[PDB]
Design a protein around this ligand. Sequence first.
Ligand code: FAD
Ligand code: NAD
Length: 432
Amino acid sequence: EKHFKYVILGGGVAAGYAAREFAKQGVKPGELAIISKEAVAPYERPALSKGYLFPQNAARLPGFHVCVGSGGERLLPEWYSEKGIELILSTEIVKADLASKTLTSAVGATFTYEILIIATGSSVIKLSDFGTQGADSNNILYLREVDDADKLVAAIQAKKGGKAVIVGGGYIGLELSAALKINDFDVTMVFPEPWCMPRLFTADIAAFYESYYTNKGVKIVKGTVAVGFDADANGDVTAVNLKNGSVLEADIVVVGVGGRPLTTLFKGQVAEEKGGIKTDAFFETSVPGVYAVGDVATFPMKMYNELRRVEHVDHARKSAEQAVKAIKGKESGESVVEYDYLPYFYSRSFDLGWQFYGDNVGDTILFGDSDPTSAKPKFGSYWIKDGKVLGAFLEGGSPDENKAIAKVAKTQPPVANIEELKKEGLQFASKI
Ligand SMILES: Cc1cc2nc3c(=O)[nH]c(=O)nc-3n(C[C@H](O)[C@H](O)[C@H](O)COP(=O)(O)OP(=O)(O)OC[C@H]3O[C@@H](n4cnc5c(N)ncnc54)[C@H](O)[C@@H]3O)c2cc1C
Ligand SMILES: NC(=O)c1ccc[n+]([C@@H]2O[C@H](COP(=O)([O-])OP(=O)(O)OC[C@H]3O[C@@H](n4cnc5c(N)ncnc54)[C@H](O)[C@@H]3O)[C@@H](O)[C@H]2O)c1
């Protein structure tokens, strides 16, 4: 039975960035523990679907421990022990009782706390959820944690030069389709929607990336779903059966069909909304002394005057920081300001890299070029509602251009002339 003044439950992005903030805020040896079911210290999860899969110069632990993903210092296991912050690894909590402030591990150990930070992130929706036949065949893989990534690297090696089917057209789908093609697989991506990345992309943006990918040799099958998987006598996947009637041969299948916030330990004990744990502007739940951050939190997004849940990395880092600031502020008598987040999303495919800021609401225009067979692609999009820019996307931007579009999203400037916005889209951003 161990007690700590502060317990972070989960050892991911938000956990690590919260530890770093606790350090900055003066935490003392013996005050803080992090409990994680993973066997390693907090790391930059984004590396797992990018640099981890590169066929050379790949990312590997301990290189991508937090906080190197945002250009900060690296927090190795030794940083935590030198600060007297205890890492309790390979420990999965299976029961949380918020009244008695007690956590229980699968093996029966118990942990009590005074303040709890719920940083349990998301799990992955699985094809067993859809009732897809044969979905338990071997070499049908999902990607969330570094153990998953290691299985994937192992399959990439064992099936070298084979066929991969990627089930899903979101973030995992785009990144993994690219990764498998770069590792010399024949790759087909399958999804039900009419264009990829429906959670952000417009039809116009999606067409650029889908043409890019098919020019690289990736096949895309839209408007269908998997209905079953053939397997061999060892139970290893051999083929994906589609609802449209097509059967795709496959040595590896990777699935990216959505994440789910891991809130199940807390059902009934805290207020929920939009699938996550409802919080205030300081990441406090409906239970005092219990905070939720990162992917599990539904919080007030001040600039859009709405409750939202964000399932991306920038928010996991900044929410973690805000929570610790609020906790420390409450212990002194000190005021903290309400979280004021600008959504920042990004991804990379092959030699492409885009950034998006703000809100994808209103009607869209493109600017730049747009031609996927251009020497060096560089184009963007503005989302315009009520005469003002609410969202901005840019592929191929310099650091100054990226900062400029972020300033557009943050300040929501009015648009006088649309044709002058489309010719000179970034001149507009730079004048803001
Ligand atoms: C492969 C991959 C690539 C990504 N890349 C990007 C990207 O490029 N850009 C971007 O904006 N976003 C990206 N994301 C999303 C981003 O990483 C998440 O928003 C971020 O990790 C959320 O941080 P978190 O702390 O809330 O959760 P997570 O980092 O998932 O951390 C949750 C932690 O809690 C542990 N946990 C859960 N339940 C328990 C329990 N019961 N007991 C003990 N431990 C538990 C988990 O094992 C894990 O350590 C990506 C996600 C994935 C999966
Ligand atoms: N660059 C990034 O921001 C980035 C990269 C990797 C992962 N992630 C995160 O990791 C989590 C997992 O990503 P994800 O791509 O699984 O989810 P996502 O929410 O980004 O995409 C879900 C996708 O599942 C597909 N889908 C739904 N039903 C399906 C079906 N029946 N059959 C085939 N496809 C179906 C859709 O094409 C949809 O695009 C999310 O939180 C995501 O934000 C983010």
